[PDB]
Amino acid sequence: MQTIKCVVVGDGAVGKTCLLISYTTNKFPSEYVPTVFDNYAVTVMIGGEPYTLGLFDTAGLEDYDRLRPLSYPQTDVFLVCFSVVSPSSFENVKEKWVPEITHHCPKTPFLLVGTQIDLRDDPSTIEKLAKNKQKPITPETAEKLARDLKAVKYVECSALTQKGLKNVFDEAILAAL
């Protein structure tokens, strides 16, 4: 039974664990705890074949930088995540994440993934961003970054509502071929 290794990396608190748990249990983590590392497994069949989709969650906090690379071997596809409602996380995609995964896995394809899209229309987050003279990252801006950084493509979702959630992993699986 062929396996597909998918690793999720990105700034701390951007929603990496939530999207993984939401996608594999259809539930939402009841609280936040910065992860160290963890890995789940789920079976899918986009090609009549029973593949084992290995999902690897990593730490986003820099405090855990030394440990993070341990999850990178034999990775088939990377999911570089950022919060569409958190600009700083978007910038670190090119300032930290892509550089890191391309340093450890130059040949491995990755997707740029926007998370927390359900907060784009949330009053308080919009107001919060405006007080700082900012606005949610737009699909167009991210899709550009994806092209510049040579990502397979961009995709976004909401672990909360699951809007786009499945498509994210369908693509990941597609890119892992």
Binding site: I21, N26, P29, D38, Q74, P123, S124, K131
Partner: protein, 372 residues
Amino acid sequence: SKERRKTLETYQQLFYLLQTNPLYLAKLIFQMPQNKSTKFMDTVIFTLYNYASNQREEYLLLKLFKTALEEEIKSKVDQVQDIVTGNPTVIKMVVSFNRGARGQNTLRQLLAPVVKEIIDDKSLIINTNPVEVYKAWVNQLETQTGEASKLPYDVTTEQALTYPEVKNKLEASIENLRRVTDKVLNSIISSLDLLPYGLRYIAKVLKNSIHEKFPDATEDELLKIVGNLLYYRYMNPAIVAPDGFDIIDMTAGGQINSDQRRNLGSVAKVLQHAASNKLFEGENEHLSSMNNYLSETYQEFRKYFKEACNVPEPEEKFNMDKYTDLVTVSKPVIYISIEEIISTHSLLLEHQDAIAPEKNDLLSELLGSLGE
């Protein structure tokens, strides 16, 4: 390992709580004797910045802050004014967390311009102290005059004003000060909407709490407490120490001059009085001319403070329903821990050439995987 076991457990608990339950760590910090909570402040605040980076957790921090402040009020506050004299560690953490949360540029993105204006004026020398001005005059200007200082060196306050010259420098300083001060005050008063929701909300909880316990407290008294939080505690320190609270980036060179300090310090004195509705007098009589300004500034501050509390409940402010109506899961938490090694009795170490520490060599086969 008597004393040593303690220390170990302390760090063990501390870093366990920091990663997995900072809200609870915070709570423990609040109930510790006050002097002792000081060493944990920075490290917990730092972790809260990350923890509270999403609205659901910021919501929980707000509730923690709230119940702790109310817990403090109806438990240690007996005659109002206690929430101020008592120096509650909850307020200290609320104040700090709001300084450098992650809307970051809040105080510097509000006081830097006008503060940078007072620091840059290489000529400004406000000094509301007669004796100091007096001594600073010919007592320091007779340098390029000779005769040293044929005058009575070191005089009182009442007689420093004998010399009209000295009464003039003060006159100007009083003018300067009021000009500079008004600049600051306008930056503040006009930017109430730039203040952090969280800070505003605690000011509300604060007021609504003292008032619930002391109905005989007047709008005036309440707003003076609320002003203590927002002005004297929150932003006044940034005005006096912009280099300490990072209001103005300090490029490797030199720190604030005594003149710059005295300048910023004088503005803070003036504004403190205004927010606390205290006119100059008795010993501070020579500044009485400002009493008119102080009373208008207070009326502005008062309006400001009252409006600061005008804000929704976190449940409403963040649509918490997107969270409370969810089907959640609580998978087991993995965290980074500190461990100690037992330590083999010297008796067996003296003979490790014959005995020999146990070792898992079939371990490199286990190690040879990790993540498949």
